[PDB]
Write a protein that binds this DNA or RNA. Sequence first.
RNA 1: CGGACGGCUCAGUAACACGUCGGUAACCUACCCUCGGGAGGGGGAUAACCCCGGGAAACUGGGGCUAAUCCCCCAUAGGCCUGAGGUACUGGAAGGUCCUCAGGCCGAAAGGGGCAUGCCCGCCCGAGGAUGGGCCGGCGGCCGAUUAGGUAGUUGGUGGGGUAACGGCCCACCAAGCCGAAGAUCGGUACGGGCCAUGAGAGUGGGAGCCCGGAGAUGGACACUGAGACACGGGUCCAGGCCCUAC
Lengths: 242, 123, 108, 95
Amino acid sequence: ARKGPKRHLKRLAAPTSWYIHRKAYKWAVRPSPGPHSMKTSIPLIYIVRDYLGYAKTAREARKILNEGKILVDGRVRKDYKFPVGIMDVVSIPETGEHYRVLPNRIGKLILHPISEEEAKLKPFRINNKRMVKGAKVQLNLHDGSNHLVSLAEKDAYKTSYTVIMQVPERQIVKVLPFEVGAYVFVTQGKNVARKGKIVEVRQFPMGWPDVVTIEDENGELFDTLKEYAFVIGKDKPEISLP
Amino acid sequence: TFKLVISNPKNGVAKQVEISGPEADKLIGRRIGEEIPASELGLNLSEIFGEEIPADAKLKITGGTDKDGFPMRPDVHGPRRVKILLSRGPGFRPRERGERRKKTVHGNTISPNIVQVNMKIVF
Amino acid sequence: REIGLRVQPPAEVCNDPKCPWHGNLKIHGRYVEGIVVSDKGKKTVVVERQYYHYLKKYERYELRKSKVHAHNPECINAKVGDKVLIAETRPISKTKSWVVVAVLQRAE
Amino acid sequence: MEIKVTEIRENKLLGRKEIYFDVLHEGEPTPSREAVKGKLVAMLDLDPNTTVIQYIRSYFGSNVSKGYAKAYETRERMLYIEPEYILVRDGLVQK
RNA sequence: CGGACGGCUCAGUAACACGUCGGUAACCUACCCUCGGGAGGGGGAUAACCCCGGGAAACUGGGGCUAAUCCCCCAUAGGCCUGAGGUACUGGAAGGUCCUCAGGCCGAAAGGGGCAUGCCCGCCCGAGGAUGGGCCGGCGGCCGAUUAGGUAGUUGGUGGGGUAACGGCCCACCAAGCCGAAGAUCGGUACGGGCCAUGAGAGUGGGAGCCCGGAGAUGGACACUGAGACACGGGUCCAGGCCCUAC
Ligand SMILES: [Zn+2]
């Protein structure tokens, strides 16, 4: 009978969103708690070793990470267990490389190369709102982060809008609302990695979540959950997507 | 027969001596924490310590150890061995946090089964 | 408060804190319908509902019954023969984790 | 024995060149490490030191083997990154 | 700081133990992430070390001396309870969060270490998340009638206690309810599933080895410390076995 928390992960029990050989070895790296969920993230060791190929062994990868060479959201990360997730930027200045982390049409995480100018912005979806002592407004975002705003501009933010920010200093830019002609990118579900414009929203009683209808870029309609719709623009995306 | 370990605090030295006969049986029923004029045991404290020590230099009992190796515990009364569960000393050196062991110890009062006695030169 | 369902509230006003109308008790989860079978316990009702279970090998169905114990507030005094609406909530006693929220057809 | 370089990568972080090459030896056994290293450096203008050969691998019937090599700039970075067993195997350090 | 994971077995268990769908607006969470804030003033002990040792061993006593990211005190912030108001936030819905006033209880911190002429690693508080758990519900899943009536805190209610938390979990009082031939209760056998063997298939049988979950550490019971244990290489007692002994 287990008497405490887990500290190990077997490869056959790893999440499907990863690109990992399951029958090669017995153990996998167990991610440490952090910004994103376990089903929507992946550690840095795998990005450095198995995705880009800058190393063949975990010792080399750990040396690279501890020398202060990899940035995430503009910050040096040395922990090989740190999880990287959707809409995150991975940058390497000694090679001028910049990648955005996104999902496939299967649900697996890939790196899409971007430019050094767009690598300075990250969109954050608002997941919740709170009042904190002193009468301040706290927005709780999708990566698990938090942001403070004043009481006077509380109506300019809601629980499904998107906020674009300069990532190392975290200053707000270009709020994008949830409306009936907004452009959205789907992150989870069966229609993952699709994009389109909103058409209709539907509410339901007693806990059942709301639903949203979307029109494809060629005329086809589909549906999904309003929590899986990530606003990225008004009529034209504001980041380079695949 | 008793072996005394007499310690001088102002210096930091200690001497070991032996005692027999009435000079020994004058110690029974004496509890830890009692004072005894050294004259009543037949010892010249200045002569053994080799630095002269003045009169009325009455000693005090601190602890001891018995013939089988078990030490005295001031909190237990009587000359009888007991076995009790301990969290601290004397009589138990804990090697872990929150550890408790069932140790056997001797009580306050002195008895012939005791061998070593410890004394502090008091002024 | 007007709760997150769509039924008419009762024309009475209870004062018991264990009521979803007029009280502090809160409903969450599933909600089903059924008929009352017993109303002998104080503020307690037994509810039954029927359903059909498919047997594969023989390609046919059998009828099964389900009993549920529910709380019955005073503003809603349901009796035997009534068709009632019940909702899930926190445990109130050893056997009761459901509460009556509306009567839909009285009996005679 | 003849050599044919198939691919080269630059690793700017660890500070190395990673070389994948083929070795054609028809009618001959698998060549040693000394000869392969001599030829590699003589051709690509690499320091004989600061160059370590990983596996040379033969196949079932090929008369064509494959090879991986690492060329470092400095020797201190080399000794810091690479493990001692390949260094002893190549002969740049003693056991 | 960790040792509560990893590793081993299948005795017990016919049960919300397992599987799937849901809920916690009824709860806890060290290591990790983000944001907002702080680090003021004092004191003390004691291992190591020196002088004596005791004991067959296992182990262990006295005196002297001392430091810290060891221990304690004061302060301030802060946490909790209750009462009266305002209605700013989330949500499907506020015993929830925010603002005002009042009466009270508990009560922080290592400005430390390193490099250097500010940077790195760290300490305490608050709001959220993540990770891991606890609890609840609907549905599903062996054989027996030469096993037919069973239950007495048993079923419910009012008021309380206790818990991290809802709850007959426990208590005082008021009632007589609850399950059952659509098979209760009792007994037998058995870790559960993903899966496996066979067969044209319908179906029949098994479920040790790999993964998820549960339980256990000679049999039984009970506690300390810690974010987390009633603890597989920690503790206490009884029963049943064994080993050393200067007995
Ligand atoms: Zn009512």
